[PDB]
């Protein structure tokens, strides 16, 4: 019982042709193809009842759809512009079932004008203020994440090589560095505080872990930095005395 | 034929006040309705279905929602919110009982719930950058949920909107937003100006 989207973003180029992929293992006869914007919640592109068939959603238009196998349904960008920036999600569903729909995972996709514009992250941790650990006995660390674009980075945190959820925050969205440039680059910042007899034994390690995602293998590239392709860049710090 | 609406796009609350979120519906045929909420980094997961069954609804992580015919609504709530409860909430509709064929979505509601700080000392910190390199942000914490922080004036300045982080250890929340440049001039003792208490220290 899963519903898988084949890439969880993408980075394409004005113009160009686009491929998405959902696969299910249910048997489901269903599957819809939606996209997700902010203030316009989930609106519906096409539809598919059953192998062979297609249907038009609400949105149809600029997009195209294949359902060859039953359990498969490709959507097809035709001509790639900064309309069709979003986020898509793929949904299957039974004929007699009574379960409802299964969603994928989503799958990002945002549409730039230029491919050497994609840069990663570098990635710094600031180590807290003295200040705050003897006013609070708390300690702040804070990790930048830096010079990206586009808008594709998740952040985490590891305290002892295990992740970390309590004490953590990280901004819901990042400022732009350049913010008049129509695709400036952007900046994320995001905290851990931990008690300061935490932070103050050197057994400790703390690492920023930050995942990026801009541009697959396939991708041409010629320009002198390294290919901007999905990694992920960690920084890190010790305990103090 | 089948519409839903979502009145209100962003609802702010207190820790423990009551939630409610609406959704309104329009149908020529017997409507099913459903609720959907997304977590920060998750998927769209089923909150609660209306399926004929019955008028008030019981769904997870402690929401309800009636189903009002002669209104022509299906609103959620919850009587005292949690931070937990932070997220993006669909409503939708359909014609099958059991949300088989297609669903329409709503618009949409971001819920955002403010901390109550119980014991604020709002200061401003110096935070060195690291492998022994001087770089400087700014750390502004442990503030009143009544302070908010606007942008920058100067440009070349990056300053965050406030955030809110959970220590379960101690049970504990604090509030804090960073500033940071690599201009000579910036000093912590000068990056944030923006109705910003007068109690704060400054080291």
């Known amino acids: 019982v899963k519903v898988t989207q084949s890439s969880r973003y993408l980075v394409k180029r004005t113009g160009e042709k686009v491929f998405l992929e959902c696969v299910q293992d249910?048997?489901?006869?269903?599957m819809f193809w939606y996209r997700q914007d902010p203030g316009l919640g989930l609106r519906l592109i096409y539809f598919?009842?059953?192998?062979?068939?297609?249907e038009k959603g609400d949105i149809p238009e600029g997009y195209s759809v294949s359902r060859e196998k039953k359990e498969r349904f490709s959507l097809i960008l035709e001509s790639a512009s900064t309309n069709q920036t979003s986020m898509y999600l793929c949904?299957?569903?039974?004929?007699?079932?009574?379960?409802?729909?299964?969603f994928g995972s989503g799958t990002r996709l945002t549409v730039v004008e230029d491919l050497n514009k994609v840069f990663p992250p570098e990635v710094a941790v600031f180590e807290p203020s003295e200040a705050e650990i003897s006013h609070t006995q708390k300690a702040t660390l804070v990790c930048l994440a830096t010079g990206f674009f586009p808008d594709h980075v998740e952040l985490s945190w590891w305290v002892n090589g295990k992740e970390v959820h309590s004490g953590v925050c990280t901004d819901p969205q990042p400022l732009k560095e350049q913010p008049a440039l129509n695709d400036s680059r952007y900046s994320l910042s995001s905290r851990l505080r931990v008690s300061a007899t935490f932070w103050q034994n050197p057994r400790n390690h703390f690492r920023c872990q930050v995942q990026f995602y801009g541009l697959s293998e396939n991708d041409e590239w010629t320009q002198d930095r390294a290919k901007p392709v999905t990694q992920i860049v960690s920084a890190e710090a010790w305990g103090r005395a | 034929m089948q519409s839903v609406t979502q009145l209100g796009s962003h609802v702010s609350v207190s820790e423990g006040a009551l939630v409610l979120l609406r959704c309104n519906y329009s149908?020529?045929?017997?409507?099913?309705l459903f609720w959907y909420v997304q977590y920060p980094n998750q998927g769209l997961q089923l909150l609660l279905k209306?399926?004929?069954?019955?008028?008030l609804v019981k769904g997870i992580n402690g929401f309800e929602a009636e189903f009002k015919k002669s209104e022509t609504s299906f609103h959620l709530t919850k009587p005292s919110a949690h931070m937990s409860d932070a997220a993006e909430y669909f409503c939708?509709?359909?014609?099958?009982?059991?949300?088989?064929?297609?669903?329409?979505f709503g618009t949409g509601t971001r819920l955002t719930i403010i901390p109550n700080i119980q014991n604020p000392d709002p200061a401003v910190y110096q935070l060195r950058d690291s492998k022994s390199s001087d770089k400087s942000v700014c750390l502004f914490t442990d503030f009143d949920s009544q302070t908010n922080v606007s942008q920058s004036k100067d440009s070349d300045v990056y300053i965050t909107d406030k955030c809110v982080l959970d220590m379960r250890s101690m049970d504990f929340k604090s509030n804090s937003a960073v500033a940071w440049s690599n201009k000579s001039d910036f000093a912590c003792a000068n990056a944030f100006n923006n109705s910003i208490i007068p109690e704060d220290t400054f080291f």
């Open positions: 939708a509709v359909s014609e099958s009982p059991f949300g088989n064929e297609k669903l329409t």
């Open positions: 598919s009842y059953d192998v062979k068939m297609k």
């Open positions: 949904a299957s569903s039974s004929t007699g079932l009574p379960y409802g729909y299964t």
């Open positions: 209306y399926t004929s069954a019955a008028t």
């Open positions: 249910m048997d489901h006869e269903n």
């Open positions: 149908s020529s045929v017997p409507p099913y």
